[PDB]
Design a protein around this ligand. Structure first.
Ligand SMILES: COc1ccc(CCN(C)CCC[C@](C#N)(c2ccc(OC)c(OC)c2)C(C)C)cc1OC
Ligand SMILES: Nc1ncnc2c1ncn2[C@@H]1O[C@H](COP(=O)(O)OP(=O)(O)OP(=O)(O)O)[C@@H](O)[C@H]1O
Ligand SMILES: Nc1ncnc2c1ncn2[C@@H]1O[C@H](COP(=O)(O)OP(=O)(O)OP(=O)(O)O)[C@@H](O)[C@H]1O
Ligand SMILES: [Mg+2]
Ligand SMILES: [Mg+2]
Length: 1151
């Protein structure tokens, strides 16, 4: 039940604030009783009073000042306590996440963890900021009203109490519905948001395969579900509002039943009865307004329990534990015996079944194994990402548990086969790798990393920008950057995986030699697949089924007739904003008629009540006037019923219009994004997170800017006009004070509601950066844990959140001050109006009834306008967001992907002709990669591409897929211009596989079927693809078969498995022309020959392009082309290339 246990001074401050709120709530019935007594005194006088009026005004002013001071103090204390608690909870959660083990992170989805940390924290802040204080004040006011009624009212008090519970329940329901709107909207739209985020994550592959139809259908279904949920919520809110409105009419009808009882009633005059009724109404309103705190108490308790459970997950392996010891004389020595471990996703499968391995300091040790032999698993185990199920792994003869992952990973840096990076500058990545580099270690790593051409020629050598996940950077460039970053860290246990054997082997000799420069000062384990690299390795160890079989020098392995020998032998405005008229044309007017009706509801009742007040005055008029009072009460009840009906109708119409507009806008935005140039997405402005936030936080802004804005404006204008007309007609002198106080009162009312939406929006805007940092740390938590950078990340997050904490505290203080000022202004205005009415009554300028009616009408109009403005959103920054949205819809891309204009060829001959083709990237158009190269390819021809890293082969392949356009030259397919052909049709027929393909985090079968878009992918196609790629056996070996779930970035499979899956999907796509980038890679080279050779069987009848460092794969190619700085030095048969002493000949000789 209790969740607060820190900052006992904070608890005392909260208690003081609650006491002040209760005092104000109790005083409110005191003000009601004072008003009733003043009314009774005026009625008695009408049947000297200046001194009494002045004394009452002074007492009211003092009471209002005290109430305002107490309310301000309570609000400020509650806001400060809520902010401090939120900050402390966020810090504790960050610390727990940093201390959280790798297993916990693997078990719980990182995206789900971030979503929880955001949503639960926001809900706790919303439900603990002002809800408790408001509930306490409402309860105190209700108790004071009940106490006052018990001693004053007798039968009237009993009737008021009996009628109270229905109105209290209605107000409670209305408050609960109004308070928790985000929980209903964002929760429903979370599915659509996640779908959009997933689509944006692999938009590149989606455009490559043209699978926009499925994404559009899913988005449409999610939008329809969200619209249905919103319509239901709006209907419920309208019903609650109608019930609340009818409650006032019912209460008025019940009160009017007195009649013959006269003002005397039991023992008091009409003033006492009116005061009792007002106190009962105030108590019922407070009870209704105290409900939301209790209603959200359950959600707050659930969020607090979840946060505590996450924080209270103290694991055995703690990064902040002081029980361990930090090793200093860490000599290079590793020993693993009977090492057995199983992944958590598939516990049944045991990749490692024990083995004996020993590595000495300053010794280059390489591991060679079959497909999925456990090389990546062994590297991960060495990095301490997981734990050993059985066996014993020690470093320097000491158990790993002695120094924990803390001292294990913090001293050894490793690079994965496909290292991840951040969309920032290269210098930023270097600094992230090591903060204390001082520009010396970075320079040394750059010199050793052999990365000069890319850094030098490209602009901003130390500030060169890289897209998401280093998309702009080349695969070889990315590998070189990762190697340099690892070297800069100055690690003692180097871990090399797929250094440069990705695209061309020519760079491999340049890279491996560099690795030989510094390979004796510390232990180094590398995963080599080339013959030269394997031979250069000091020691090579053979693994099979997770068991070490061979271990020794290259000569020993060759003479042992082991797996290495077999592998070697095998190798050999309104117009732009009011766009709802298409669907809202026959409904908006229906709402408008309601809005005007609402404008008439506020003043009309103000008059009717006034007509009652005068009827209740002058000794309740004569006996004949009783029928007039009854008629006035009946008219007021009818007007209230009509107003409730009109409000319900207007709310339903507004909700329907808003839902329709939001759905249409979302559909248009999705269509525009799908039919957009690929180059547009490759820019810092089109960030995945920023784009998702803009897309999600658009419906509410547009709705509030158009529909709610118009409704509020119309209602306020109508109310103000009606009030002014009534005051002028029935007011001569008192109208001046009402007009003077109108603007301040209206502003206070507009800023009189909860206004939590603005505070939440400001907090989200401030903490967007902190959330992005947290997401980056969680997604790449493995990299941070490897370098033991948890403390630095936590410090950075705290520093970034500190400013938002101060801004939120200042905003809360400002809001509390504004609320206190509004309350004090209302209290003083009441006394001023009473004094003005008394002064007017003293003279013959106007009667008491007219002045009272004018004052009541003015006050009611101002309060209604303020409440409508505060509750209903109005002009704000949302309009600006609309400018960012509409321009997106109206924007047209350079290439009309959606447009069907395109020549339809009779048949596909699989012929490509490029001549003098020159292309330049959009981000860096001053550094072109092509100088007018040419290439001819015929049907059923196998072409291989080689050359220096980043020579343009990948760029040429991308251009072939119509990803971009050439600055100059000519590109034709089967003697036909590519630009004059369908883009989607051409892409669907192109089997393009990138160096780092993206696999959706879903079932393997679903991912495979997604390759063949616009057609049904039966299980037979998947089986055939697996057989072609030899993946059926692997799928059967793994649990769930094709139903196995895929985690983030394919966490359930290795790089080789992902490459095989991508190849199988491309084959299933039935591509007339196929292209692969870094298809071979390490990927268990021995297994690759099994798959690659199979491709040769399927290569018949189609043109295939393969780029890889291995010479064996290129040998089978019909033609081989070498590109040097975008220029094809030579092209022809393998024998011709071998005869010529070119780049290819030199590479072959080196290998
Ligand atoms: C509708 O019938 C009426 C009932 C009471 C009163 C005035 C009674 N006086 C003691 C002043 C109290 C002001 C009052 C309270 N409590 C109040 C004012 C502003 C508020 O913030 C929006 C509020 O909410 C807590 C309550 C309510 C009557 C509106 C006027 C009325 O006519 C408008
Ligand atoms: N997190 C995981 N959950 C389940 N299975 C996994 C996970 N990581 C890897 N695997 C699978 O377990 C086996 C581990 O193979 P490992 O990656 O260690 O060897 P490898 O020869 O270096 O791999 P590759 O050439 O595919 O990169 C492979 O089948 C891999 O698909
Ligand atoms: N979107 C991009 N914006 C700017 N420069 C880019 C972009 N994509 C690639 N580059 C640059 O173009 C060159 C990439 O060359 P290319 O795409 O032809 O690859 P490659 O030589 O086949 O091999 P790899 O797979 O290693 O990139 C590198 O200079 C890279 O920095
Ligand atoms: Mg591997
Ligand atoms: Mg490439």
């Amino acid at each position: 039940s209790m969740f607060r246990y820190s900052n006992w001074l904070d608890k005392l401050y909260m208690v003081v604030g609650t006491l002040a709120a209760i005092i104000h709530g109790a005083g409110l019935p005191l003000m009601m009783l004072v008003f009733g007594e003043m009314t009774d005194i005026f009625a008695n006088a009408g049947n000297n009073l200046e001194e009494d009026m002045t004394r009452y005004a002074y007492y009211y002013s003092g009471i209002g000042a005290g109430v305002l001071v107490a309310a301000y103090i309570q609000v400020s204390f509650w806001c400060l306590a809520a902010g401090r608690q939120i900050h402390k909870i966020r810090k504790q959660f960050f610390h727990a996440i940093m201390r959280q083990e790798i297993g916990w992170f693997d078990v719980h989805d990182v995206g789900e963890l971030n979503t929880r940390l955001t949503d639960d924290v926001s809900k706790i802040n919303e439900g603990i900021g002002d809800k408790i204080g408001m509930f306490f004040q409402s309860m105190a006011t209700f108790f004071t009203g009940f106490i006052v009624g018990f001693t004053r009212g007798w039968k009237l008090t009993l009737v008021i109490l009996a009628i109270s519970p229905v109105l209290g329940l209605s107000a409670a329901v209305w408050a609960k519905i109004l308070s928790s709107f985000t929980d209903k909207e964002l929760l429903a739209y979370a599915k659509a948001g996640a779908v959009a985020e997933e689509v944006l994550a692999a938009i590149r592959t989606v455009i490559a395969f043209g699978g926009q139809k499925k994404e559009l259908e899913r988005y449409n279904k999610n939008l329809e579900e969200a619209k249905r949920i919103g319509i239901k919520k709006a209907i419920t809110a309208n019903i609650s509002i109608g019930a609340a409105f009818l409650l006032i009419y019912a209460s008025y009808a019940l009160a009017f039943w007195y009649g013959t009882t006269l003002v005397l009633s039991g023992e008091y005059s009409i003033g006492q009865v009116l005061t009792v009724f007002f106190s009962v109404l105030i108590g019922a309103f407070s009870v209704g307004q105290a409900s939301p705190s209790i209603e959200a108490f359950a959600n707050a308790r659930g969020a607090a329990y979840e946060i505590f459970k996450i924080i209270d997950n103290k694991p055995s392996i703690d990064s902040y534990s002081k029980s361990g010891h930090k090793p200093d004389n860490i000599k290079g020595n590793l020993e693993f015996r009977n090492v057995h471990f199983s992944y958590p996703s598939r516990k049944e499968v045991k990749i490692l079944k024990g083995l004996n391995l020993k590595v000495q300091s300053g010794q280059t040790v390489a591991l060679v194994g079959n497909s999925g032999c456990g090389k990546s698993t062994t590297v991960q185990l060495m990095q301490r990402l997981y734990d050993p199920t059985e066996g014993m792994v020690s470093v320097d003869g000491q158990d790993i548990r002695t120094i924990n992952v803390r001292f294990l990973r913090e001293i050894i840096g490793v690079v994965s086969q496909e290292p991840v990076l951040f969309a920032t500058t290269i210098a930023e990545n270097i600094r992230y790798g090591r903060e204390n580099v001082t520009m010396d270690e970075i320079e040394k790593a750059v010199k050793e990393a052999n990365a000069y051409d890319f850094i030098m020629k490209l602009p901003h050598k130390f500030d060169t920008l890289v897209g998401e996940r280093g998309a702009q950077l080349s695969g070889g460039q990315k590998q070189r950057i990762a190697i340099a970053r690892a070297l800069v860290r100055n690690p003692k246990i180097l871990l090399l995986d797929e250094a440069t054997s990705a695209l061309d082997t020519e760079s491999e000799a340049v890279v491996q030699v560099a690795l030989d420069k510094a390979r004796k000062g510390r232990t180094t384990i590398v995963i080599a697949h080339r013959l030269s690299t394997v031979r250069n390795a000091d020691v090579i160890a053979g693994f099979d089924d997770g068991v070490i079989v061979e271990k020794g020098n290259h000569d020993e392995l060759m003479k042992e007739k082991g797996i290495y020998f077999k592998l070697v032998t095998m190798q050999t405005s309104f117009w732009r904003i009011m766009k709802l008229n298409l669907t809202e044309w026959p409904y908006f007017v229906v709402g408008v008629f309601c809005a005007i009706i609402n404008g008439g509801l506020q003043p009309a009742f103000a008059i009717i009540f006034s007509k009652i007040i005068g009827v209740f005055t002058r000794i309740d008029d004569p006996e004949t006037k009783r029928q007039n009072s009854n008629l006035f009460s009946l008219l007021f009840l009818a007007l209230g019923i009509i107003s409730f009906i009109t409000f319900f109708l207007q709310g339903f119409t507004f909700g329907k219009a808003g839902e329709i507009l939001t759905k249409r806008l979302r559909y248009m935005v999705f269509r525009s994004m799908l039919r957009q140039d690929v180059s547009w997405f490759d820019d810092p402005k089109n960030t995945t997170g920023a784009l998702t936030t803009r897309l999600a936080n658009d419906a509410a802004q547009v709705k509030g800017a158009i529909g709610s804005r118009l409704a509020v404006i119309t209602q306020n204008i109508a109310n103000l006009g009606t009030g002014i007309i009534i005051s002028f007609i029935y007011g001569w002198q008192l109208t001046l004070l009402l007009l003077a106080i109108v603007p301040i009162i209206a502003i206070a009312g507009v800023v009189e509601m909860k206004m939590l939406s603005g505070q939440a929006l400001k907090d989200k805007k401030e903490l967007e950066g902190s959330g992005k940092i947290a997401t980056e740390a969680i997604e790449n938590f493995r990299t941070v844990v490897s370098l033991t950078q948890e403390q630095k990340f936590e410090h950075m997050y705290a520093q970034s959140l500190q400013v938002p904490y101060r801004n939120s505290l200042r905003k809360a203080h400002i809001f509390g001050i504004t609320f206190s000022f509004t309350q004090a202004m209302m209290y003083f205005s009441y006394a001023g109006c009473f004094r003005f009415g008394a002064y007017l009554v003293a003279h013959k300028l106007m009667s008491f009834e007219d002045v009272l009616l004018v004052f009541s009408a003015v006050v009611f109009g101002a309060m209604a306008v303020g409440q409508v403005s505060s509750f209903a959103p109005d002009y704000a920054k949302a309009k600006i967001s609309a400018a960012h949205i509409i321009m997106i819809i109206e924007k047209t891309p350079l290439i009309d992907s959606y447009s069907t204009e395109g020549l339809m060829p009779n048949t596909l001959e699989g012929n490509v002709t490029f001549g003098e083709v020159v292309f330049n990237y959009p981000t860096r158009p001053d550094i072109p990669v092509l100088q007018g190269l040419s290439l001819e390819v015929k049907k059923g021809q196998t072409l291989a591409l080689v050359g220096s890293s980043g020579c343009g082969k990948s760029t040429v392949v991308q251009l072939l897929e119509r990803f971009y356009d050439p600055l100059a030259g000519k590109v034709l397919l089967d003697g036909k211009e590519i630009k004059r052909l369908n883009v989607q049709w051409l892409r669907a027929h192109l089997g393009i596989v990138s160096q780092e393909p993206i696999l959706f985090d879903c079932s393997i079968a679903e991912n495979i079927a997604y390759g063949d878009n616009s057609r049904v992918v039966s299980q037979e196609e998947i089986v055939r693809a697996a057989k072609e790629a030899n993946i059926h056996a692997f799928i059967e070996s793994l649990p769930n078969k094709y139903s196995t779930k895929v985690g983030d970035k394919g966490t359930q499979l290795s790089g080789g498995q992902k490459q095989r899956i991508a190849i199988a999907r491309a084959l299933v796509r039935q591509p007339h022309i196929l292209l692969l980038d870094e298809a071979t890679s390490a990927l268990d080279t021995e297994s690759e020959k099994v798959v690659q050779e199979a491709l040769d069987k399927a290569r018949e009848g189609r043109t295939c392009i393969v780029i890889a460092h291995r010479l064996s794969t290129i040998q089978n190619a019909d033609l081989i082309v070498v590109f040097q700085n975008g220029r094809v030095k030579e092209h022809g048969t393998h024998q011709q290339l071998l005869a010529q002493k070119g780049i290819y000949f030199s590479m072959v000789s080196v290998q």
